[PDB]
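Form 12-C: Joint structure prediction
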Amino acid sequence: KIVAYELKTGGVLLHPIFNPASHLHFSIKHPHTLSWEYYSMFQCKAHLVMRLIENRISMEFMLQVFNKLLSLASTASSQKFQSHMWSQMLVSTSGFLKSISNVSGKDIQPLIKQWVDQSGVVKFYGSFAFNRKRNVLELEIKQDYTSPGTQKYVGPLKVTVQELDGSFNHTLQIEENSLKHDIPCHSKSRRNKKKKIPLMNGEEVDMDLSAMDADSPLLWIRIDPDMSVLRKVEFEQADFMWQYQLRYERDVVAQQESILALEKFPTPASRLALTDILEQEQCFYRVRMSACFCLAKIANSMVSTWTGPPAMKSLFTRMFCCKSCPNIVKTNNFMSFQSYFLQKTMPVAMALLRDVHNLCPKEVLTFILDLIKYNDNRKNKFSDNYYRAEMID
Amino acid sequence: NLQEFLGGLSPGVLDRLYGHPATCLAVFRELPSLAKNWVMRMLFLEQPLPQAAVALWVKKEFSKAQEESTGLLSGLRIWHTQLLILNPIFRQNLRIALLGGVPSLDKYAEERWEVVLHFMVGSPSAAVSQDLAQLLSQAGLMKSTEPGEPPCITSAGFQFLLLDTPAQLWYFMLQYLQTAQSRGMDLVEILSFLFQLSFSDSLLNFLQHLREFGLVFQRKRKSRRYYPTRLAINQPGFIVVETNYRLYAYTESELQIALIALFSEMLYRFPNMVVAQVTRESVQQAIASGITAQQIIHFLRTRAHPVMLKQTPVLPPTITDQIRLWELERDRLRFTEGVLYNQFLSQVDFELLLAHARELGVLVFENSAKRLMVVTPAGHSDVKRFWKRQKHSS
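Section 2 - Result
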């Protein structure tokens, strides 16, 4: 939301100094002259910058800062002196930074100078190349700092590389003149023997390594995984790396960004990846709800190649319909709250299917109308208004 | 073949090459079967005729002969559709060609070719001729790299050596013509003389080279008249092969003994016989030098003593199979120049890039499973631009 708004119009400036922001058509000196979208993005950017301050100075020290502010205010709140002490209930920026420096011993003045006083987000364009001879991974990260909403980042940058030997984090120093970052790569001895490949968490899984390159061990790369800067990343992986990142990652933002990047690769391996995500309980439900729409877009792009039925129909009849009647939907029992959301989002994406004539097929429209006719809600303890409203959608 | 040589020519050189004296007859004799008949038919016609007649003028059976003859003579451009009348110049020359307008020599040719082959091989005693040496060096079968030291023999040299005399001489003359064009000698004038044989400064030099090769011999202190030898127009065996890789060759000329020693170990040399052994060492030595088992087998078969001709096959299966297996035992490294890309993103997009390097001729190896295309540095400035254009198209 904030990178869309700041690249759209100028930027949000937390803590201006009194104009400080002349790129935008109102004055930021008073709350009653702000646009309402600017007020909403102001609150949004403020809580993300506080998450960044928690990233630099750990969460227990952050809660100690907040407790110190509240304790000064509550010793202030019981005095009777007319504001000799009642102004300890008012916080400022300098007092907040001083309380942070009191509890931690680190000051955050570079982070405050970059993300508060400066009003911009950063844009990262990354592309890699694997050097087989020296066994290194040559990243190439360049910033677009000449757009109207952007600024230049010179700090450190975390990158997480999943190779066959596991998941390794690397810190890159991205100075102004930097372009190529050579990080080292590990072995490929988990392709010699079939062993399980260890993940970002402690677990390990069986991966189908037939799509991987023979010479490179690395399975996927993620630039800034923890969202530790206010950034927009445009990484150029290969399509099998996006499919491996969709399947076997233990991070929901990486599964979402792989869904978002698989729309450019309409190959049938990506259809298999999104269909395996859709069938998979123990995936987070908002990833499967995105995989519905991604599968609809991919299915629209590979018409005159699609083999069987329309997308997600057989999967809907496998998950939510009767075993004896495929075209009759099961009676509504909405007590699971994840297959309820997936059931009410799957025909909405299924209706975006189009034939070679650019008209929605009469197999999906008839399916949606049979979902509407055979709807029986006399048996669940929950209402049907959102599911029926999504059927109209 | 001569058909290949003449097919590899332009119309402008072809019509000029169709000289009055002989060319119209020498090229006629090339016509394998039927095109002779059609040439005779429409030798007397001044009016072109429709192609359908020629098409239907051969029965349904054996039509492939009709199409192949028509294609061959279309390549030779003997006629033109003109809408199939023959070329007027060829018609006139052919009408003028059709009722219009030694024992010591063969030995000389044999001896001259034998001494030429002796020089080709590392024979201490051989005929000396700087022009012949440089001609053989530039023919592609010899490389010197050091004028002071005598030139060595390249890999193609051994293969050329093991060929039979007819094909050997024919290929040598083909290379002679190809290098004649490079050195600037007119190709048509020299070529017409070869055709005239089977019935200027450049002419004198060419005849001198032919005499050095032994095809012709003036015999009169280099007079205008010449008496071509048998080889100019265009024998029993002596080797006996045992089942224990033993060769008994009734050879008196050192050339045959040298040729056998090229791929066999010599044991004894009698006045009218020589004993050699075909061992792994000798055979693999020849293979490394460049020969392949096919040349050795063909050489032994062609120089097969009459005694072993009765048995079928002439060459024992054990010897032939052993030679072939010995050659197979060796498989060898290669050399090329290339550059490789990576991170090709979409699959259907990588298939379009494969056709760019294949049409230009800079593609070496492709990989659709990993997306891995090797591009030679000679055309690197053209593939990258195409890739950039594709990216721009998105």
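Section 3 - Comments
The first strand of chain A starts at residue 122 and ends at 131. Chain A touches chain B through 15 residues (CB under 8 Å).
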